[PDB]
């Protein structure tokens, strides 16, 4: 069986199961990039710790378009999952781009899938997105744009100096 | 009067009355069900508690219904409200099948009448039943879902032995 | 850098980034069984919750080997996180007997990297591996071992009926 | 006596006397690296602070390892404590630098004296070095690295700046 499924189109079943392997991807990416800022050659603990967190938050993304996927009758399908794109991230700022690179494409595919489900008339989808991943999208994104400007401010002719204080007076807890 | 409608149209009005006559026949229903349960030969308490509880909720959507009528300026029409479609209802395997049919009627009810919300763009229609009324019907059509499947499974060749079974391990507090 | 690496080979870094491959690839097993016992064709609660608890334990154990990694100097490198071995796991006993098949594997590589560390005279690794994952594996085979034994007591003749049992009284909470 | 003295070589024994000469050897380095930040001339109460409590910890390490001597039936002797390597050490960095030299070879004496008692077929010793000493050095020598990292970065053109700000942003309680 399925005894429930209702209203619920094998287009956004499956267009669910790829925005789980993204985010599910884009978890993972965060895991390396938290682990790279533990490395003792970059040792930047409030780095390492923004983006642990992320990881975690990606993983609950991913956990929660899966109990959706069941609610509506549809199968979980899982695919493989592509290691990140890069092995080292260079600095808080070349990090806190590809964040937001991420992030944005993370967003398109709700916006996709929220389009998708008002093209299939599903508002309970529409709704779904709406309430757990739309704004924490465009939350995110804006704290990620408000640290890129402050790390960029710091860069200044004393790089090390500014890294160094972004995550000492605005990340570390 | 009304000196406070805004964006409300007739087509809706007339809607929203005749969902408020589908809550009460479903929640009717409910208390049918219930009492069934509690007869002294079928002696299920679990089970009716399950339908008693569901009769009170069918009644509060429909409650919400009406004061968002007249929240919107609209005016409450009251139909009679026909009585349920079985007297006697079978096993809890019968019950729950039935009771899946009411729900999922009830949620095209509610996909129908979000649809004409969306032609009449009504945003705040929309809204409402997103809010407080889609999800709700997908989470519980769910916990039906999941206890039909427990309960086809205990059927076996000891059908008594698992209706309960059923009643004593999932259902009954 | 590293300017802290001692003692710590080559050989011994790498495997523990095959293990970490290997840890998560358990855990991603483990997220797609819990999501498979919550399909409402499938229904059993206390499986999946047995399931998702063991993908939270499987990931801990990977960034557990990845702060260790860094801890020693060696550099964390991700490769790609293969799918599960199947979309759909049958019944309780099915996933069970897979679920011992990977503790089984997992184990083996614990055993063949203490093995490593020991030709390699590295202690604190051996130590590692003892203090927060042979006893943690060993317990976790003899509790699924105990659960298979106790669902293949209750298959009988009377299949759906055991697979209901062993859920409600053995696991769910 | 000893009437307690089992499995326990006389080259252990002598070797766990000359490791408690190299602790309290490092608790005098770090005592004389503490005293050196609290010079009015040089000032840095964060960079004290962090070399006292290193001082404790070696003590403490010295007398764990007494202790399990006697518990052994082994025979404390102690040998004269040479001075520090020197009377004045220059900037955190340089004291940081040193501090590392000084733990990497307490850890390596640690391994030699692991490799002594797994060639001597010790196992209790071998679980002792494992239990309190291994991964405190490991824990030790990541923390630091890090510091380490974090104040090269900080030089910049601007060195005094440097110390100053990882004094206080880093060490100081
Ligand atoms: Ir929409
Ligand atoms: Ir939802
Ligand atoms: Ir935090
Ligand atoms: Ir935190
Ligand atoms: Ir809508
Ligand atoms: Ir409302
Ligand atoms: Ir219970
Ligand atoms: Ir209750
Ligand atoms: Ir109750
Ligand atoms: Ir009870
Ligand atoms: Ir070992
Ligand atoms: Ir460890
Ligand atoms: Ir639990
Ligand atoms: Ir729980
Ligand atoms: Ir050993
Ligand atoms: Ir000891
Ligand atoms: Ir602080
Ligand atoms: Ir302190
Ligand atoms: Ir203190
Ligand atoms: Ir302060």
């Not at 991913?62 to 109990?67: G, I, T």
């Not at 309970?124 to 739309?134: A, G, P, Q, V």
């Amino acid at each position: 069986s399925s005894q429930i499924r209702q209203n619920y189109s094998t287009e956004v079943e499956a267009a669910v199961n790829r925005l789980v392997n993204l985010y599910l991807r884009a978890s993972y990416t965060y895991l390396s990039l938290g682990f790279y800022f533990d490395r003792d050659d970059v040792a930047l603990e409030g780095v390492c710790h923004f983006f642990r967190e992320l990881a975690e938050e990606k993983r609950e993304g991913a956990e929660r378009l899966l109990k959706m996927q069941n609610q509506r009758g549809g199968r979980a399908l899982f695919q493989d999952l592509q290691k990140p794109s890069q092995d080292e991230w260079g600095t808080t700022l070349d990090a806190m781009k590809a964040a937001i690179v991420l992030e944005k494409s993370l967003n398109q595919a709700l916006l996709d899938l929220h389009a998708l489900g008002s093209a299939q008339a599903d508002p309970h989808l529409c709704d779904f997105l709406e309430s757990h991943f739309l704004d924490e999208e465009v939350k995110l994104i804006k704290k990620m744009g408000d640290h890129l400007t402050n790390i960029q401010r710091l860069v200044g002719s004393q790089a090390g100096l500014g890294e160094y204080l972004f995550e000492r007076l605005t990340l570390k807890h």
